[PDB]
Amino acid sequence: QFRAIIESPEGAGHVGYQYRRNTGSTMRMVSDVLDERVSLWDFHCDPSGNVIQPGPNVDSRQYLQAAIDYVSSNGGGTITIPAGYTWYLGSYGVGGIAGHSGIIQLRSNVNLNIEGRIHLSPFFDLKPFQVFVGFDNGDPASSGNLENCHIYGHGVVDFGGYEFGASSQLRNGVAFGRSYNCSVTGITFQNGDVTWAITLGWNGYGSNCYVRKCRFINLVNSSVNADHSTVYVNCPYSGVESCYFSMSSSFARNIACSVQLHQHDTFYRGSTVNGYCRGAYVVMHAAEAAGAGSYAYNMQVENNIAVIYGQFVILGSDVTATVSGHLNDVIVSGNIVSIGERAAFSAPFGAFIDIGPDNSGASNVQDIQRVLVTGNSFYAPANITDSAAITLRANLNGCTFIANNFDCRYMVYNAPGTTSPVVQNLVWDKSNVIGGTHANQRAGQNLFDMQFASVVNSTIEVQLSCEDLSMFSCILFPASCQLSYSKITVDSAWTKSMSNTAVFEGNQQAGANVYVSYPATVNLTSYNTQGAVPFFSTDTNYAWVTSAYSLSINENLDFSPPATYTNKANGQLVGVGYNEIGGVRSVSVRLMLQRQV
Amino acid sequence: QFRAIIESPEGAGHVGYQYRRNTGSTMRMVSDVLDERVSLWDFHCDPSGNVIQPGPNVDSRQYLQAAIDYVSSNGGGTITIPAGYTWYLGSYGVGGIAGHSGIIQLRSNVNLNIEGRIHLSPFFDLKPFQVFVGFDNGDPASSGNLENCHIYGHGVVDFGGYEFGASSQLRNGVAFGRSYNCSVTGITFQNGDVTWAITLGWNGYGSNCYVRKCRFINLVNSSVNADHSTVYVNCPYSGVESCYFSMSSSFARNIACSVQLHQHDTFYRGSTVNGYCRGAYVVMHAAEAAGAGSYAYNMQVENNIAVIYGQFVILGSDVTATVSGHLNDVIVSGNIVSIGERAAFSAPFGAFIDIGPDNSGASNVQDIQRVLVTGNSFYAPANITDSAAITLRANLNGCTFIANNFDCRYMVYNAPGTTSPVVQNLVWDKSNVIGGTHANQRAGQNLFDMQFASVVNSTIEVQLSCEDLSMFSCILFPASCQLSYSKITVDSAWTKSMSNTAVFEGNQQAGANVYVSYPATVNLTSYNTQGAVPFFSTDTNYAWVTSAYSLSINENLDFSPPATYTNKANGQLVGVGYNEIGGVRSVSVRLMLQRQV
Amino acid sequence: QFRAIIESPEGAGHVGYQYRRNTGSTMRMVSDVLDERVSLWDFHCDPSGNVIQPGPNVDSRQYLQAAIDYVSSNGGGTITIPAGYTWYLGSYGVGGIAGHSGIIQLRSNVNLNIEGRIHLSPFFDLKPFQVFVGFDNGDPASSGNLENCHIYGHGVVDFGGYEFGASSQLRNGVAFGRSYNCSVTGITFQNGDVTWAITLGWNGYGSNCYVRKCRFINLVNSSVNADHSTVYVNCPYSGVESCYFSMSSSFARNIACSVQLHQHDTFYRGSTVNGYCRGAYVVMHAAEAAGAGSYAYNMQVENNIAVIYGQFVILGSDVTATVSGHLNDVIVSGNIVSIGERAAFSAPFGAFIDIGPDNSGASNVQDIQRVLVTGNSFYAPANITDSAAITLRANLNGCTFIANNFDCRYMVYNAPGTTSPVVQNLVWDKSNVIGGTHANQRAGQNLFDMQFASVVNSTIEVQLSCEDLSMFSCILFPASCQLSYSKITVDSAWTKSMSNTAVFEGNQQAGANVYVSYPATVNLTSYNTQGAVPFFSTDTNYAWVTSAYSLSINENLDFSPPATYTNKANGQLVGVGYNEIGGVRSVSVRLMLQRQV
């Protein structure tokens, strides 16, 4: 019996131990100390209790699930997935996670320290899957919560390289579910064709979920893949920080986004992206409003580094039959972004900010306002015609740009003959610096191409920092665009040789509450009078001008044109110059035309 | 004897072990390997060495203290507080921590990995307490240091929900003391009525202390609670990053602040706050200047998200009989903040920046300068009368605002008939965007209400981005406010219909070194002369004007008023217009009035 | 035999264990569970397998190397360096690391959890060393990679205080080598005279290497030390975050830099520096371009706090016989920096941004462009003559400044009679706020001292916020500096009493594509005519002026000078004023002179 007890599975339970021989310490057994930790080895055994080695011909799923289920039953703990081994998963889970194509069911308070590698076996080729699932019911609305579940370590989740079998399939790494205080830290997710790597929350249910110091590498690989967002943040008070995202696939340049921020008080910070179509969507979907209300507010995209092929930040909000979503109180700051090398029009239209339609193309459902875009840099190579600081493609209730540096083809753009957004409260401060990479590339183009239904309560203060005489105009409003209660200015620097600076194809600058200024060339004739003598414009399209002043030198000795002008009822400009000697004078002069400024 | 040895507490000390059967590895005993780790179980035992189960009727204090004391004696290590259990504390500690109402005494090099839960028992109801204390003497000035002490894990400190018994009591979670290289990471502090959750340092003594990835939830619950600051940073080279702070109590909206930054080279970054009165104080108290000098400099509040009811950042500095505190070299950047939904005047006056008096109400002791506030967003709902970008309530030696977006009732405010601050070096750049939420709400109010003793070396460049004809003025200086060596401008956009733009109730704009411009309506009469003809203002209050220019169109054919004006000794404006046909002219015109700009 | 087996090193291999008595768990032996972890104790033994205690007379090197080598052979894991002990290293390693003066060779997948202390023994006094080396060959070009190697914990690497023996020696803490997914977290590096603490990558080979939450304290101590950079980042997709850097040595104020960012997609964030010469270099060395190309792009320096004695960020790029390096797409944001207290000229010239020559002094090899410097604060005490926002000492292809607050002696500076940079695309937005600390200190100095060969496509919008009548000028161009296609403006506020505002010593403001404005004092005489009457300047150096306007009041009743002026062919200004009564008038007036603006 002594020997038999010691050799039996209860042997460690008979060997005494006291910490460091301290007579004040608990008199324990070895088993009690070993029981303070737990690994997959404690469950990775045959029906006789003999350990099984992991490998490509072993399905580790049931063993990991048994470990999770047991630790849960004791109120939680942390299960180690050992280093130096690859643990393969080769079958679906059962029960509530089956409605999610789930492999492993996560449980509250049960953390996973992944030090080794978790691979998917070829069972999963061409099939849907969600590797780790925190829902406990196939219907998320009927699911319980997942709380206090953290996945962390130096290890790896490898999706086996398998393509999707059909575009309608879904694949995920970690779905925390209705998740409260859950996180992923340090993990590398790689080698897949998946929809998401990590999802947080469900339709606003959850809180305090985070993804930190994770790597996401090569997670789209086929034309079958319908769509990819690496992290979907669908609960408030949650976010992504200090992560690395990389794709190499052509497909990823057309379909993949790094982050979705879909509920209030969410953030995306300090991360690096390469090879993606898109950086982040910041969106309130009415269809996702159940758990945390109808407003996405306190949305922060800061201090990221990106090389993308489409758009960096995409804003949206939409409606359902019974709910209306709203997006407000957003900050986009400190990001350094560029469109990677590509042919013009070879990926979705390049942009720093996109105001996008809804998923069904509607541009008249959005309620997006109180956005601050400040202190960012954007660059697109000179060949990329389709590059803009903002593509403004749906109704906009406000967006403010201050102190950014935008070096791309367009500043503000929307395609003509497409949507006709209603724009309010678009503010483009004079402190936005417009780069010169695309100088000479702009034939036929307007730098600010105001292809909108209407613009109200808006400010566009254009400041060039180099010449680009190729552009048709600095800013153009088609006659279809109403303009009211707005300030539009074009600083004169680098504009002396421009044929057109600001263009109002419907004469909209004449509006009662339109405040404008821009340079123009004007032909003047004087009267014959020696001495103080009036000069008048030969054209009559200045009835809107409140004052104008000279931007040209006077090469003459015997007279000078007026330094300043106002107008007359018939639309001429008039000012008082000086004839040292009499005579009718005729001059062409560059003027700053001003209205109410 | 073999069997007896094995079953005894030294048994593990007799069972040999060699790592992985490696013949090159140390020949050890099992006990040596078990001795590499340590948990509360190794000390949580009765006088006979039998383990005690934790629970609500067990006081775990003495056992945890014994563990800390023993590990300290070996030069440190990390004690695990096991997952799956709640460890209750039910008595005060003894010795040096007793003067701090202490429960547990922390010791140098002894880290706590809290995986389970630490609860306070009802012994503590209505009483003061500090759960973990790093002082070793009841007099902090006589205390030794705490160094290299880190508290981390997935676990919880729960304060038991108990109210304070008297407002004069103090409660804390972690007081590191005179703390060098100490930190808290990952811990949830919840369910309390406390003064602080964590304090770092003591009166400038300490260094390199941090709070990272912690949660602070529902830490004020009663009207008895005098005051709450969740983290008090009282040593240099220290800070708070990536934390979550939430309150639900009405009381918290009136009393609670998230962070105190009280010594140089301190920071508060990347955190989310909801339900608090205040975000952070940035203060140099003379009474706290012993350990790190009399200056708080290199103070950083960046990239936070907040919903508060009072003020986001509060600046201060003060004096004692023998020490003077100074605050300088501060940056507040990238924050997105809003005043939560509340009635006007129902909480402390809403503000992004407050320049506050000292704790005894004095407004003439401060030395605050070299502050940069840039790239932040602030919003307050339209009903909140008491909302301002800056409430400037005490003497200010400098503060600079660049490229912020402020959407609230006031830009600059101080209450009339209260303090009369002396203001120097207040810079409000034109790149600050003024939102429109409060348009139409401003009857009787001045957007910039300059209720100061004096303003010098200051810049206010007002730029509207929508109309608000309800306001009395854009900026007003009462006659009691001296103004000198300053630049005050009001851009004309959205101002055509304003009765008052800039108001100087003491004619201060006439100062020799005052540089101003703002719009006004002026009535002009001309002489009868055909040809070049002067126009003169009918009022005589323009003796300060250096130039003026038209902001109005000229509806006439037969004449034009001057485009530009200067003045005359008697205070009229004068300019040269043009009478195509003679006659006395009378016009009303909107002018930009300029002085030295 | 039972007893002998149990007492032998295989004893633990005979004692059965089953986790928590769970009948579903693996039937293991105690040794299997102990084998899940590994420490230095498992290798720190004599040839008979008896444990050796560490200490100052024990060389732990061979034991730690044996541990690393063994764990590597099993596919990796984490070796604990135990707390409560100091482990001394006292000899060089052997093999591939010997060409790097290496002590310990790191291996892939083998992490080090340093909880205790690692000290260098006096064997290393006056000698080179690299403590941990990830190269596997003495020739880095012939080295294999290091991957998945993480060093972390609460412990310490102490360099023993030893001085360098010769300036040509190199010393390092961690050289990861050709390093992929390697990191250091939490470690304190202290007490040394070293070249680097940590190097990441080798000549562009590597990826995803990081330094987080580390401390670097007193790592230069002698005049022998040639040069120090605490972290050298020489692989892409890598960076430094949330670290603390401190020096106390006089030598460090002249030689030490905190960070080198030398490859694309690298970052330096959230860190605090004190006592260093320099903050960070951001450089593309042609000599380092092998692994990741010839371009350093996506370079981010954000949200740091620093007290330095030289320059905060230094930009560079250079060439070799066959490679050309390029630097572009850089952002420097949110930093708060100051030059520490020191005498003028007592350390390298103080600067926020330096555009530095190459290591051999060449100023005509650089290709630096697309840089955004925004939302930073800089301060230097008033005595520090040698302090500038930017020292622009080498060719510059672009740099943009928006919304910074610079409080130092110079805004833009280069020494006269030194290099003559070619400058393109230097943009200084009007939103940069110029502080007043150095007011009254600027006798003989130009605030913007444009000591360049040429300036093109540049913008300098000078805005003062207080007077400084000591300065010679706000901006000066020597006649040797060509100026073209540029915008130079001096706002009038605080300039009324300045003798010189903008100075063009070669009359460069007359260029066809130069856009300028600045204040000047001008003497005017009128004709005798009653009524509208011309005024003309008595000097003739205004042939470049397109318009001018009054900045002065008119003290006269009987006449007024013109509000606005243009010029004439002979270089006079001319405008139309008004003589109520006739007579020749003579006045001196402050004008805003304008050219093409």
Ligand SMILES: CC(=O)N[C@@H]1[C@@H](O[C@H]2O[C@H](CO)[C@H](O[C@H]3O[C@H](CO[C@@H]4O[C@@H](C)[C@H](O)[C@@H](O)[C@H]4O)[C@@H](O)[C@H](O)[C@H]3O)[C@H](O[C@@H]3O[C@H](CO)[C@@H](O)[C@H](O)[C@H]3NC(C)=O)[C@H]2O)[C@H](O)[C@@H](CO)O[C@@H]1O
């Ligand atoms: C890839 C991506 O994120 N694309 C976003 C786009 O998101 C919408 O389209 C994607 C396409 O993959 C998602 O829609 C697919 O998935 C949902 C959800 O799956 C079901 O519910 C989950 C909980 C369960 O585990 C599954 O087994 C399914 O039963 C399907 O209902 C839908 O038919 C399918 O096309 C995405 O859905 C959201 O997904 C997140 C993350 O898993 C969930 O938290 C949300 O509950 C779910 N929302 C809805 C309303 O169901 C779609 O929302 C965005 O719309 C767009 C703008 O931001 O950006 C990208 O294109």
Ligand SMILES: CC(=O)N[C@@H]1[C@@H](O[C@H]2O[C@H](CO)[C@H](O[C@H]3O[C@H](CO[C@@H]4O[C@@H](C)[C@H](O)[C@@H](O)[C@H]4O)[C@@H](O)[C@H](O)[C@H]3O)[C@H](O[C@@H]3O[C@H](CO)[C@@H](O)[C@H](O)[C@H]3NC(C)=O)[C@H]2O)[C@H](O)[C@@H](CO)O[C@@H]1O
């Ligand atoms: C809640 C808060 O932080 N409020 C700040 C306000 O801070 C001042 O008022 C609070 C009120 O709670 C503190 O004053 C109380 O506590 C001090 C300190 O307690 C004593 O010393 C500690 C070390 C010991 O452990 C205790 O047992 C006590 O013996 C009392 O002296 C005082 O009478 C009492 O009202 C706060 O004191 C500071 O507290 C921090 C954190 O613990 C300590 O590091 C400092 O040493 C201590 N300072 C002083 C000068 O004693 C008061 O400073 C701020 O003044 C205000 C502006 O920033 O913001 C909030 O209102």
Ligand SMILES: CC(=O)N[C@@H]1[C@@H](O[C@H]2O[C@H](CO)[C@H](O[C@H]3O[C@H](CO[C@@H]4O[C@@H](C)[C@H](O)[C@@H](O)[C@H]4O)[C@@H](O)[C@H](O)[C@H]3O)[C@H](O[C@@H]3O[C@H](CO)[C@@H](O)[C@H](O)[C@H]3NC(C)=O)[C@H]2O)[C@H](O)[C@@H](CO)O[C@@H]1O
């Ligand atoms: C201290 C510092 O970082 N200074 C930078 C300056 O950097 C250059 O000068 C330093 C002086 O210490 C380095 O040059 C010294 O070291 C190199 C490299 O050592 C050799 O290669 C390594 C891999 C091996 O382990 C060693 O045993 C050596 O065989 C010597 O070649 C050189 O002769 C010597 O003066 C620095 O070199 C770079 O160092 C990093 C970090 O270790 C390596 O990753 C690079 O491969 C290596 N580069 C080159 C081209 O060899 C020099 O580049 C910067 O130039 C300057 C501008 O940024 O800022 C600071 O002054």
Ligand code: NA
């Ligand atoms: Na499903």
Ligand code: NA
């Ligand atoms: Na329309």
Ligand code: NA
């Ligand atoms: Na006390």
Ligand code: NA
């Ligand atoms: Na006064």
Ligand code: NA
């Ligand atoms: Na070498």
Ligand code: NA
């Ligand atoms: Na030259």
